[PDB]
Amino acid sequence: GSCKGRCFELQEVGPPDCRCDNLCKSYSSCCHDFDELCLKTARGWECTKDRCGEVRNEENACHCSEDCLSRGDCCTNYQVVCKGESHWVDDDCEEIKVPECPAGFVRPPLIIFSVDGFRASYMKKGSKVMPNIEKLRSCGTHAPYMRPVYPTKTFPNLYTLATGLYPESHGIVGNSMYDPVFDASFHLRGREKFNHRWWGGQPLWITATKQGVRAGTFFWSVSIPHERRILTILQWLSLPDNERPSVYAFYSEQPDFSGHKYGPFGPEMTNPLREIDKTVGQLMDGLKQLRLHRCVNVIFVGDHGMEDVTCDRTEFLSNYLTNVDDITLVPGTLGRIRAKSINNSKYDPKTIIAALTCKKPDQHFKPYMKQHLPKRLHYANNRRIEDIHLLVDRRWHVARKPLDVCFFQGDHGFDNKVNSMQTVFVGYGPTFKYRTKVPPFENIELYNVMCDLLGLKPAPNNGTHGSLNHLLRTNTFRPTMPDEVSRPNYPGIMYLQSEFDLGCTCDHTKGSTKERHLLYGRPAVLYRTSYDILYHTDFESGYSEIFLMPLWTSYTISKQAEVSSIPEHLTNCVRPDVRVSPGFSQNCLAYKNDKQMSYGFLFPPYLSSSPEAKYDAFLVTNMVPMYPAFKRVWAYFQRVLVKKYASERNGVNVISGPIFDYNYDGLRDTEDEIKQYVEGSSIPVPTHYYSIITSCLDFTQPADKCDGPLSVSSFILPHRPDNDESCASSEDESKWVEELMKMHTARVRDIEHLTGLDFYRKTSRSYSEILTLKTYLHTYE
Ligand SMILES: *[C@@H]1O[C@H](CO)[C@@H](O[C@@H]2O[C@H](CO)[C@@H](O[C@@H]3O[C@H](CO[C@H]4O[C@H](CO[C@H]5O[C@H](CO)[C@@H](O)[C@H](O)[C@@H]5O[C@H]5O[C@H](CO)[C@@H](O)[C@H](O)[C@@H]5O)[C@@H](O)[C@H](O[C@H]5O[C@H](CO)[C@@H](O)[C@H](O)[C@@H]5O[C@H]5O[C@H](CO)[C@@H](O)[C@H](O)[C@@H]5O)[C@@H]4O)[C@@H](O)[C@H](O[C@H]4O[C@H](CO)[C@@H](O)[C@H](O)[C@@H]4O)[C@@H]3O)[C@H](O)[C@H]2NC(C)=O)[C@H](O)[C@H]1NC(C)=O
Ligand SMILES: C[C@H](CCC(=O)NCCS(=O)(=O)O)[C@H]1CC[C@H]2[C@@H]3[C@@H](O)C[C@@H]4C[C@H](O)CC[C@]4(C)[C@H]3CC[C@]12C
Ligand SMILES: [Ca+2]
Ligand code: NA
Ligand code: NA
Ligand SMILES: [Zn+2]
Ligand SMILES: [Zn+2]
């Protein structure tokens, strides 16, 4: 048939009839007259003086006739040129206290305006280059920058924005991927991306449709120019109440292309930024023309930043591996390695990793088995993520061999904490705040916000719902603190010293402990288990009788506190805990028989308040299994760094503990999932150790008497039997441990997922502020 009267229709027609929608050029299914009827270009996209009040001519791309406003198809500048109206950008900021929408609108619409490769620092260029974007920014709600997901590439980030999920969960783990179950590859170029099997989770357009909220088609065939896309959105916004969508999207491919060619700081970046701003200007003028400029919520959001990268900064795997033709490399600003052929039984990942580990002094990438990547990246739990991963230094590439390789000066893809990868967020409209700055946040949080903006219930996702309530004038969501599942026991003196046969040798009480050492209340255990609260002068812990060690150990170290040494006669001291059964305690004979495994302590003897109290630090209930290699890291943290942090931050409260994540899903392991124990024992081996280090944001107040907001940094250290990750680890600990720790920085939330614990349950702060605190990441950038 014809597309007459159905150009860019909001219902995709089945395989009997031809199509007239946004994507009919991509699946080459358009009616023969789609180009003629739906892609008119005559006289361009702007009204001029001589066209004002013209008789309508159906050949024109947009109209300047008296009927155009009623028909909803004026050029965006019609009112400005023909009716003496002002451009939206020339109007003062005026607070939008309530949505001002035409009658019949049931909710404020949401428009998502996405930009590809828009570096946070581009907003520096100001009104001189981007006057419309700068008005949105300063008038609405904005962050200094927004953290994308890893890898910092287009598709993983665009689908993360839409779903609230990590790539490991939504399935778009790269612009390129191989799936070994499908035995097929996915690429930006090609038809494979159109198959539904790749795309998991529930994107916003689906959440909307399932709950009765109609969505505009988010995507366009590339041959449809930007001006037509804006006019079509404006057209859809003029439909009747029963047909009009409530959510829309526009995606710009700029300024990515120019960034790749000229680099992020080229003079050539100005015009692409002007072009995007012009497009924003057309949307805002068009909205104003329709009287929807104080009705619609607009999000201006980037997918990632852009870095200086040239082909002369390329590492080649052929300089490291002898049999480089036996492997397949996903290359560039990250590396992923698998066997070239599945028939090759000789392929060995251990050999590959070893060959790629600390071989050149300036070496500009580092290899990892995926389960050993920093947990903050959340990049492992998907069969499309190859076992071998290369984290590449900012400014560099990795390639397989030299003949694989100047056509570019910019790239992206690196670690999402790198500054050049940070991107933009602006929220403008009745539901966002007025002239408000908010702290940097992660793009995984936006799905929840977009659902709140539309009155939708979010599908289960990786955001923390409530953590961005402070972006909004009005909230449909009020978060609730979860219910504790397991109540603690508080055991007294229940057992004799001589009743222990553990092979170990050595040469209000509640109220005082709790108020000094648990500043923010007891963590809640959100799963079914059996644990005991143990009180001591210097620290408090929740001891698990199932894992035979603390789930958490909590203590406070003032700026005045003194570092002592473990005296030589107590080096091998481990003491039984009379409150805890011998059958629910560790034993020292397990450690003697296990030739690879030693032990450490969660509360450090080095920071004990007296020689008397120090004895509690050696209790069997404060003991945890530690590889000798890891003890170098842990000893340096406890002996040197905790004190240094207390000094710099005016006291710190520390909560430390074990993490078990053998299946690398970022979630607390059950007993069944633990694959390693201290030899011949029931004592499970942690994959990581965490600490959460809290103090007062106002550091002139000490940590234990803080009136206002809190300040937190945390980490999740991998519990490794070597220090191969750290190329400088033969040197003194002062030259490498802290760099290791900063690489493994983490959010409190990451620790909560991995432990099934809920922190900060008793503070003077609102729960919404606390959720914000829990999503914070200290990046060291
Ligand atoms: C980040 O946030 C994520 C989302 O909350 C967390 O990921 C979730 O993790 C849980 C716990 O492991 C996991 O639960 C398992 O689910 C198994 C069933 O798997 C299939 O179905 C689910 C459910 O689909 C529906 O709901 C999801 C939200 O979860 C929604 O996005 C879907 O569109 C769909 O919606 C429809 O239903 C809901 C109601 O149920 C309606 O509300 C809605 O309107 C819709 O009608 C899917 O999510 C699964 O998807 C995975 O697999 C497909 C196919 O391969 C992939 O394409 C997809 O990307 C996704 O892959 C990821 O997860 C799997 C694990 O499922 C990984 O292996 C993979 O590598 C990816 O990471 C499937 O289609 C279920 O069998 C299993 O049950 C068993 O274990 C539990 C105990 O845990 C026991 O209770 C049971 O008795 C069983 O023995 C378990 O329940 C979710 O599947 C998973 N969801 C997603 C989207 O990943 C993630 O943990 C979190 N991360 C962190 C660090 O916090
Ligand atoms: C981003 C992607 C296309 C962008 C692009 O670079 N195109 C290349 C040039 S051209 O061919 O488009 O002209 C969009 C277009 C259609 C979308 C797909 C839809 O059709 C059908 C599916 C809808 C589901 O809710 C999600 C997955 C699903 C498969 C969509 C995934 C995202 C899809 C594939
Ligand atoms: Ca796990
Ligand atoms: Na040992
Ligand atoms: Na090393
Ligand atoms: Zn991009
Ligand atoms: Zn790009």
Numbering used by the authors: 56 to 460, 468 to 569, 586 to 859
Task: Give verbatim lines from the article.
Autotaxin (ATX) is a secreted lysophospholipase D (lysoPLD) that produces the bioactive lipid lysophosphatidic acid (LPA) from extracellular lysophospholipids, predominantly lysophosphatidylcholine (LPC). Crystal structures of ATX89 (ENPP2) revealed a catalytic domain with a bimetallic active site adjacent to a catalytic threonine. Substrate binding takes place in a shallow hydrophilic groove that accommodates nucleotides as well as the glycerol moiety of lysophospholipids, and in a deep hydrophobic pocket binding the lysophospholipid acyl chain. In addition, the catalytic domain together with the first of two somatomedin-β (SMB) domains, form a tunnel adjacent to the active site.
Strikingly, however, the conjugated bile salt tauroursodeoxycholate (TUDCA) inhibited ATX activity with an apparent IC50 of 10 μM. To understand the selectivity of bile salts on ATX activity, we co-crystallized ATX with TUDCA and determined the structure to 2.0 Å resolution. Owing to the reduction of the C5–C6 double bond of the steroid B-ring, the four-ring system in bile salts is no longer planar, but adopts an L-shaped conformation. The Νζ of Trp260 now forms a hydrogen bond with the 3-OH group of the A-ring, instead of the 7-OH that has moved away. In addition, the conserved His251 flips towards the tunnel exit, acting as a ‘lid'. Given that the tunnel may serve as an LPA exit route9, this observation might provide a mechanism for the inhibitory activity of TUDCA. Unlike the steroid moiety, the acidic tail is not very well resolved in the electron density. Further refinement allowed modelling of three district conformations of the TUDCA acidic tail. Thus, TUDCA binding induces a conformation change, which may have implications for SMB domain interactions and binding site dynamics. The observed multiple conformations of the acidic tail, contrasting with the well-defined binding of the bile salt steroid moiety, agrees well with the structure–activity data, and prompted us to examine further the inhibition mechanism of bile salts towards ATX.
